[PDB]
Amino acid sequence: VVSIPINNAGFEDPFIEVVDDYTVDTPPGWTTYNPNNLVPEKRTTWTSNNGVGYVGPGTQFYNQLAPEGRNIGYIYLAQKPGSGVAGFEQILDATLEPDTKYTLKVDVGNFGGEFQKISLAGFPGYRVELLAGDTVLAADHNNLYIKDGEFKTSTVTFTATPDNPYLDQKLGIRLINLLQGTFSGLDFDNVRLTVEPA
Amino acid sequence: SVVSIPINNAGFEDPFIEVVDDYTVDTPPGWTTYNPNNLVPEKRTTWTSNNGVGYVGPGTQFYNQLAPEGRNIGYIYLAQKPGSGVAGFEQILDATLEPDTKYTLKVDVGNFGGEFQKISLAGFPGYRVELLAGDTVLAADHNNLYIKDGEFKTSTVTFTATPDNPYLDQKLGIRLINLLQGTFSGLDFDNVRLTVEPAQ
Numbered sequence: 001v002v003s004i005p006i007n008n009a010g011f012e013d014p015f016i017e018v019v020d021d022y023t024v025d026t027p028p029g030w031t032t033y034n035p036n037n038l039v040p041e042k043r044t045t046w047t048s049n050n051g052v053g054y055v056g057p058g059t060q061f062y063n064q065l066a067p068e069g070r071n072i073g074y075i076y077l078a079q080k081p082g083s084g085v086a087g088f089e090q091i092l093d094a095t096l097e098p099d100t101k102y103t104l105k106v107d108v109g110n111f112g113g114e115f116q117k118i119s120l121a122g123f124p125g126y127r128v129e130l131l132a133g134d135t136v137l138a139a140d141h142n143n144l145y146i147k148d149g150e151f152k153t154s155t156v157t158f159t160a161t162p163d164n165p166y167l168d169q170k171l172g173i174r175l176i177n178l179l180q181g182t183f184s185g186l187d188f189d190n191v192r193l194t195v196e197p198a
Numbered sequence: 199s200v201v202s203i204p205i206n207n208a209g210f211e212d213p214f215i216e217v218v219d220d221y222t223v224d225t226p227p228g229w230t231t232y233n234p235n236n237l238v239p240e241k242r243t244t245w246t247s248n249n250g251v252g253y254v255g256p257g258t259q260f261y262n263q264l265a266p267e268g269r270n271i272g273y274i275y276l277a278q279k280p281g282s283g284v285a286g287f288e289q290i291l292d293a294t295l296e297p298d299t300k301y302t303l304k305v306d307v308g309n310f311g312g313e314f315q316k317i318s319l320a321g322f323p324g325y326r327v328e329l330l331a332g333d334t335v336l337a338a339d340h341n342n343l344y345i346k347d348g349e350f351k352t353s354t355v356t357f358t359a360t361p362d363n364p365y366l367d368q369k370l371g372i373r374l375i376n377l378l379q380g381t382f383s384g385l386d387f388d389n390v391r392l393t394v395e396p397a398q
């Protein structure tokens with residue numbers, strides 16, 4: 001069982017000091033997957049955005065601490081349900097290899113609480129995908145039920161045979177806000193990808 | 199407690215097929231051809247992209263087991279090269295999405311083995327199983343199971359609908375999809391089951 005390197009895999013970069021403070025720029029090491037242009041290049045707290053957030057004692061948004069370390073990565077979409085999807089993507093160094101089983105695990109978070117008078121109850125739905133090149137090899141499209149203010153672990157697996165047409169292409173990961181519900185924000189954390197003989 | 203939702207021709211048993219390893223090339227009754235990329239022609243031959251049902255019986259040259267359910271399986275074959283698109287079966291159910299309910303969709307997915315007219319059937323295009331409400335894919339298994347030539351495995355897709363889900367009261371739907379991300383670019387489905395139960 002081997003780990004494949006992922007940059008900023010727990011969104012711990014940058015370090016954030018204050019409880020529930022967050023960034024509004026793409027997490028370091030990741031790019032914004034934006035197939036529908038929902039996330040503007042220059043964002044504010046009133047636009048769709050993504051970034052990292054510190055989950056600590058005193059958080060008003062969760063009933064538990066970050067799955068890993070201090071921070072989570074979050075994606076919030078302001079457009080109405082059905083408008084499209086957005087999230088994070090990272091292209092890895094490793095390439096697809098035959099006779100190997102891949103295991104992608106990532107923690108998915110559903111916001112909780114209330115701010116002002118508005119509640120964060122609700123979830124847009126998630127999809128976690130494992131890629132080779134531009135191809136989605138395997139994906140978990142919203143299979144887990146996650147309660148408000150909680151996290152749960154998603155597992156995606158894929159076995160690559162010697163005749164798989166995408167061998168030698170770069171592995172990739174996408175973490176996606178499906179925007180099929182409100183509250184239309186979600187979190188991810190603790191991304192891990194391992195390989196083993198198949 | 200756990201209630202089954204009615205699905206038409208859910209084991210692809212209609213039409214009856216008499217001869218082992220014989221197949222149809224027209225859309226199974228009760229299902230529609232899901233064709234977002236126009237890969238499947240309206241009129242099909244044995245060698246066009248096609249779909250239909252097939253009898254998997256004793257003596258079959260294509261699997262190491264019989265159909266997971268009954269006599270027949272439903273299949274989808276795509277002749278275009280990997281990366282061209284996807285196609286499969288779709289059925290809209292009569293039931294609608296209900297609040298505070300957990301849905302469990304199960305379908306057996308089959309990987310052909312053997313050879314047909316000297317063409318090797320080894321390989322798999324990848325599959326996706328989708329639960330939908332209206333036009334929305336609520337939950338889906340995109341190719342998570344590894345399935346060897348000549349075998350079947352059960353895909354499980356779960357979804358929990360809360361009271362504020364925007365798609366409540368829209369009609370439930372199912373899609374069984376050939377991903378066309380490998381050759382041999384055909385696969386099978388069987389034994390579609392959908393249950394609903396209270397979640398919370």
Ligand SMILES: [Ca+2]
Pocket residue numbers: 010011012066067068069070071072189190
């Ligand atoms: Ca973390």
Ligand SMILES: [Ca+2]
Pocket residue numbers: 110111112120121122123148149182183
């Ligand atoms: Ca929520």
Ligand SMILES: [Ca+2]
Pocket residue numbers: 209210211265266267268269270271388389
């Ligand atoms: Ca059957």
Ligand SMILES: [Ca+2]
Pocket residue numbers: 309310311319320321322347348381382
């Ligand atoms: Ca095969």
